[PDB]
Amino acid sequence: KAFERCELARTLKRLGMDGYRGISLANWMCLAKWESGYNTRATNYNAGDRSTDYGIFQINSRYWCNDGKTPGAVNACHLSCSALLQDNIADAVACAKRVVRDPQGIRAWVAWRNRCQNRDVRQYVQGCGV
């Protein structure tokens, strides 16, 4: 599913992401925008280390979800990576909450540091009613 900007903003708000572990909704929006363009079926295989990024938040198979073909993988979210490809993002959000509970927080995604950190991220939620 390809989410519309404001549709996603309201959905994440309802799922309790606004201010989760100190992370504002606009930051989560900036993350999803740059990671997948708000698309839930987005996947990216990393030939270099044999892992794959799944879904709207592009969660990696080495630490977070199990896809069976990633060497030395752990499944911290206790989810099949398949779960991160659903139209309903409830599982993806539960796993993203798990990711940020680690010391790095939102910094775990390098794309966040490149395109969101120290930037005006208000634009991602403007006019959405959140």
Swiss-Prot record:
Catalytic-site annotation from UniProt: E35, D53
Secreted found in the keyword field: yes
Pfam families assigned to the protein according to its UniProt record, in alphabetical order: Lys (PF00062)
Major subcellular site: secreted
GO cellular component, one term: tertiary granule lumen
MF GO annotations: identical protein binding; lysozyme activity
Cell membrane listed as a keyword: no
UniProt KW keywords: Amyloid, Amyloidosis, Antimicrobial, Bacteriolytic enzyme, Disease variant, Disulfide bond, Glycosidase, Hydrolase, Secreted, Signal
Compartments, record wording: Secreted
Catalytic reaction list: Hydrolysis of (1->4)-beta-linkages between N-acetylmuramic acid and N-acetyl-D-glucosamine residues in a peptidoglycan and between N-acetyl-D-glucosamine residues in chitodextrins
Cystine pairings recorded for this chain: C6-C128, C30-C116, C65-C81, C77-C95
Alphabetical GO biological process terms: antimicrobial humoral response; defense response to bacterium; defense response to Gram-negative bacterium; defense response to Gram-positive bacterium; inflammatory response; killing of cells of another organism
Domain of life, source organism: Eukaryota
Domain C-type lysozyme stretches: 1-130
EC number: 3.2.1.17
Disorder cited: Amyloidosis, hereditary systemic 5: A form of hereditary systemic amyloidosis, a disorder characterized by amyloid deposition in multiple tissues resulting in a wide clinical spectrum. AMYLD5 primarily affects the viscera, and the predominant clinical features are renal dysfunction of varying severity, and intra-abdominal bleeding. Inheritance is autosomal dominant.
Subunit structure: Monomer.
Record's miscellaneous remark: Lysozyme C is capable of both hydrolysis and transglycosylation; it also shows a slight esterase activity. It acts rapidly on both peptide-substituted and unsubstituted peptidoglycan, and slowly on chitin oligosaccharides.
Family according to the record: Belongs to the glycosyl hydrolase 22 family.
PANTHER family (UniProt xref): LYSOZYME C (PTHR11407:SF28)
Protein name as annotated: Lysozyme C
Source species of the chain: Homo sapiens (Human)
